[PDB]
Design a protein around this ligand. Structure first.
Ligand SMILES: [Ca+2]
Length: 223
C-alpha cells in the first residue's frame, strides 16, 4: 500500500497472508475453512497465515494452516486478468475470534463514491521499493466505470472496477495482490492490477466480487 497508514494489530481480522516460505499475496477469510484471493496469486505449497500483524515476528495471535485445495476461477485469463479470483480451502477450520474473523460477501455491488478499506503488506513506494512488516491500510473510494475505462482504454471488463485517486500518491501495489477491498463491511474487491502504483491517472483495478458470489457459494457448498 502506497500513501496509506499503519492499520493497527489485528484491526483487519479477515486479512490473510499467503506464504510459500515468504509472504507473496493477500487474501480474505470468508468462513472458517475458505479464503478468497486473486487467481494470479495461484501457486502450489500455500500456507495461509491468519491473525497476522508483523509477518516477520510471532506475536501470539497467528494461525498457520496449509491449503488443502485451490480453485482458480473457471474463466480466469492470465493475459487480461479477467476473472482474477480464486478460492483456497484450508486443511483445518480456523478458530474464529475477535482477531481472526470472516468478512461478509456482498448481496449487492458497491457503487461509485463509496469509501472502502484496502489493506496489505505490499510495497509502500511508487518510485522505489520498501516492504512493510506490519499491515498497512488505505481508505479509498470506488471510481465510476467511465473514468475507470478512460484511465485504461480497452482493458476494463465488467468483472473489474477502479478504486483510489486519479491525482496519484495513494494506491495498493505489488504484494497487496489478492487482498481485500471492504466497503460498508462487505468484501467488494480483490487487489488485482494497475500500471505501476499510485501513478497519476492510473488507479488500482480490483476484481468485482459481487459478480462471483453465486460461484463462491456453490463452490463452497460442494467442496
Ligand atoms: Ca506475526
Amino acid at each position: 500500500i502506497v500513501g496509506g497508514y499503519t492499520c493497527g494489530a489485528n484491526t483487519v481480522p479477515y486479512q490473510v497472508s499467503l506464504n510459500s516460505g515468504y509472504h507473496f499475496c493477500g487474501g480474505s477469510l470468508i468462513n472458517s475453512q475458505w479464503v478468497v484471493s486473486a487467481a494470479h496469486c495461484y501457486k502450489s505449497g500455500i500456507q495461509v497465515r491468519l491473525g497476522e500483524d508483523n509477518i516477520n515476528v510471532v506475536e501470539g495471535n497467528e494461525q498457520f494452516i496449509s491449503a488443502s485445495k485451490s480453485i482458480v476461477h473457471p474463466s480466469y485469463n492470465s493475459n487480461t486478468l479477467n476473472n482474477d479470483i480464486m478460492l483456497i480451502k484450508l486443511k483445518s477450520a480456523a478458530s474464529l475470534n475477535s482477531r481472526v474473523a470472516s468478512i461478509s460477501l456482498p448481496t449487492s455491488c458497491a457503487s461509485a463514491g463509496t469509501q472502502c478499506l484496502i489493506s496489505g503488506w505490499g510495497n509502500t513506494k511508487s518510485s522505489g521499493t520498501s516492504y512493510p512488516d506490519v499491515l498497512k491500510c488505505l481508505k479509498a473510494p470506488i471510481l465510476s466505470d467511465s473514468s475507470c475505462k478512460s484511465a485504461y482504454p480497452g482493458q476494463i471488463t465488467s468483472n473489474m472496477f477502479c478504486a483510489g485517486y486519479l491525482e496519484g500518491g495513494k494506491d495498493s501495489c505489488q504484494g497487496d495482490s489478492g487482498g481485500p477491498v471492504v466497503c460498508s463491511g462487505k468484501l467488494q474487491g480483490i487487489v488485482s492490477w494497475g500500471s505501476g502504483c499510485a501513478q497519476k491517472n492510473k488507479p488500482g483495478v480490483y476484481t468485482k466480487v459481487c459478480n462471483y458470489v453465486s460461484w463462491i457459494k456453490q463452490t463452497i457448498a460442494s467442496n
